[PDB]
Amino acid sequence: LLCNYRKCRIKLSGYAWVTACSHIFCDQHGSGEFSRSPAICPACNSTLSGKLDIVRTELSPSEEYKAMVLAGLRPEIVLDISSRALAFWTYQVHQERLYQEYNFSKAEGHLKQMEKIYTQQIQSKDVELTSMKGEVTSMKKVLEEYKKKFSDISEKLMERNRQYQKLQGLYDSLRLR
Amino acid sequence: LLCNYRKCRIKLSGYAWVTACSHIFCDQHGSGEFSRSPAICPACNSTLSGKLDIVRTELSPSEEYKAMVLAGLRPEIVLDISSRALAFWTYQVHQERLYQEYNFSKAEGHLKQMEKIYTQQIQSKDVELTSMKGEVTSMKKVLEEYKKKFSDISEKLMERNRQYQKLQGLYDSLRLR
Amino acid sequence: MLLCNYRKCRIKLSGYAWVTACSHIFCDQHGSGEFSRSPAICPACNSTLSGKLDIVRTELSPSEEYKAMVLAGLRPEIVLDISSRALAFWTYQVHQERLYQEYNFSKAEGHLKQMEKIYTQQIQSKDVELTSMKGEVTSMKKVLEEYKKKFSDISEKLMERNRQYQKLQGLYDSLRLRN
Amino acid sequence: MLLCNYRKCRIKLSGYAWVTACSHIFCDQHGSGEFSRSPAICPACNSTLSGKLDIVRTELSPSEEYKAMVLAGLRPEIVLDISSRALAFWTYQVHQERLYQEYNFSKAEGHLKQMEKIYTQQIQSKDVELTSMKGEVTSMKKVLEEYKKKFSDISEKLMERNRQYQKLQGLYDSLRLRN
Ligand SMILES: [Zn+2]
Ligand SMILES: [Zn+2]
Ligand SMILES: [Zn+2]
Ligand SMILES: [Zn+2]
Ligand SMILES: [Zn+2]
Ligand SMILES: [Zn+2]
Ligand SMILES: [Zn+2]
Ligand SMILES: [Zn+2]
């Protein structure tokens, strides 16, 4: 068994506090909670007021106690008590199973949300890369055109140089005369 | 159930005293015997010294007690307790059956002794009857013998009378003389 | 521990037994004779059993493997329910035996008290016959004493007659002597 | 409520199931297939089963008549022993199911943490690619400015050379004027 206090859920050995609302708590939490005049079950918040609604029970009873607790009772009474005890145990097992299923469901939900956040950033990261790739291609095309303009300007510069040199020779020839 | 005190053997309801030696007693006998520091079980004379060797148990437990006495225990423990309680009940039933068989045997023994005495008194009186009948037969034999003697005496009487008459006639004849 | 519910059998049941939905159990011989028919009549209470499960041929000392597997896999609620019904059958059989024994004890006590009345009355009767014989013996004694007294008186009369005859003889003899 | 002990089935068991002496239960389909073999091996624990009562096809929803009659006639000690073994089987199935669930939860937690590590590494890769694009964008801007500024400077030198050509042309015209 495990403590039905949500923050403890520790394996129960020795002394435990059992409630009429089918809950069981460890010795420390049971003593602290079920010794107060206002007694509220920490699990289901049920208002327990009766004397037998709360019992401090040993989970490993001695041989003599087991041999004498139900001695003298009719078989119907013994069967009824055994039925109620096993009903308590099955309820505790069912609650533990539901708690584990809930935790597994929470883990699956966390994984799906994590995948959603990651995929949202995937699509964001791909768009930034594609946008930068498009900008780089546009700028490289502009650089290609400007280099072509550079080739034309250098050709005009060399052509002007040769025409300038031709005028140099004509000027020098007329100056010498 | 019945009180294991021999002189009580009353149906047990409400409160009873149960022993580790598989015996149960009524409230009055249980309290009286189990208030002694030197307390010995009246049924089997077992030396009881332990705490759980003596329990005052309610034979009609409340619903809340039945739902909480074994609440929290493992199914194996509950099975063990139920097994020992049913073992106690079967032992008590078996002892009651043996007691009833013992009472039937005692009744059979009393009947056989009753026939035994009755037959003896018949035989004694039958011999008395036979002795009286034998005496009566002897009386009848004596009666017949005396009747025969009476007849003989009557014959002697008539013979004497006739002789007396004949001598009377002779006397009368000599009277004429 | 159990007994055949047939009234004239009441034999201890071991090995195979036949259990009925009528809360009755019989030995193998009674069950085989009666519980092989499609319509089943309970030998104890004559109830008409017709269902398949109304009659079961069960071993009373089951093997360990059978005990471990017959209810294996069933939920605890089902197992408790089956145990409760099985114990209900056992208590019903125990109650029947207990009531039968108590009724027999009551019958024995009534027979015992009737025998006490019968024996005492027969003893009182036998005392009457003893008194009857005693009265007869007294009557015989009285009659015999009466006859003895009658004989004694007649004998006395006879002897007196004898003395009278002797006296007459003497008178006659003296009378003869005179003449 | 129970589940087939075959690992690839684990289906909720209702109606008929196959129970083993080694404390395992399987669905009708897997039980029929496995336990029709002469070499029949329990798929859960690989135990070699050979006995008769090691294999039972049990109904998980027994009729009321069956529940009232299956254990009828047995002693209370026998019924208690059967109940103990049946509850022992149920607790074993619950314990094995609990261990399986705990193992799967541990595996799920480990896989979840591994996916978080993998996702962060993939994000780290994309951040590296983003920095690579940042570096090339800076390179394009540096190339753009350097090339255009050098291109503009060469154009300015061309215009200065053209104006110097005009100056020489004017001086040549003046030299022509004098002659
Ligand atoms: Zn706690
Ligand atoms: Zn509660
Ligand atoms: Zn008493
Ligand atoms: Zn005792
Ligand atoms: Zn019947
Ligand atoms: Zn019979
Ligand atoms: Zn399966
Ligand atoms: Zn197995």
Curated annotation (Swiss-Prot), chains A, B:
Predominant localisation class: nucleus
Q: Molecular function terms in GO for this entry?
A: identical protein binding; ubiquitin protein ligase activity; zinc ion binding
Determine the domain of life of the protein's source. Eukaryota
Give its localization. Answer: Nucleus; Chromosome
Keywords assigned: Chromosome, Coiled coil, Meiosis, Metal-binding, Nucleus, Phosphoprotein, Transferase, Ubl conjugation, Ubl conjugation pathway, Zinc, Zinc-finger
Q: Which top class of enzyme applies to this chain?
A: transferase
Q: Name the Gene Ontology biological process terms.
A: blastocyst formation; chiasma assembly; protein ubiquitination; reciprocal meiotic recombination; spermatid development
ZnF bounds (RING-type): 1-44
Q: In which tissues is it expressed?
A: Highly expressed in heart. Detected at intermediate levels in liver and kidney, and at low levels in placenta, brain and lung.
Cite the EC number.
2.3.2.27
From the UniProt record, list the coiled-coil ranges: 120-175
Q: Name one GO cellular component term.
A: synaptonemal complex
Enzymatic reactions:
S-ubiquitinyl-[E2 ubiquitin-conjugating enzyme]-L-cysteine + [acceptor protein]-L-lysine = [E2 ubiquitin-conjugating enzyme]-L-cysteine + N(6)-ubiquitinyl-[acceptor protein]-L-lysine
The effect of residue 21 to A is: Abrogates induction of filamentous growth in yeast
> PTMs?
Ubiquitinated; autoubiquitinated.
**To which pathway does this protein belong?**
Protein modification; protein ubiquitination
Q: What is the annotated role of this protein in its UniProt record?
A: Ubiquitin E3 ligase that acts as a limiting factor for crossing-over during meiosis: required during zygonema to limit the colocalization of RNF212 with MutS-gamma-associated recombination sites and thereby establish early differentiation of crossover and non-crossover sites. Later, it is directed by MutL-gamma to stably accumulate at designated crossover sites. Probably promotes the dissociation of RNF212 and MutS-gamma to allow the progression of recombination and the implementation of the final steps of crossing over.
Share what the entry says about its subunit structure, partners included: Interacts with CCNB1, UBE2L3 and NF2.
By what name is this protein known?
E3 ubiquitin-protein ligase CCNB1IP1
Recorded source organism is Homo sapiens (Human)
The gene it comes from is: CCNB1IP1
Whole-protein coverage range:
8 to 184 of 277
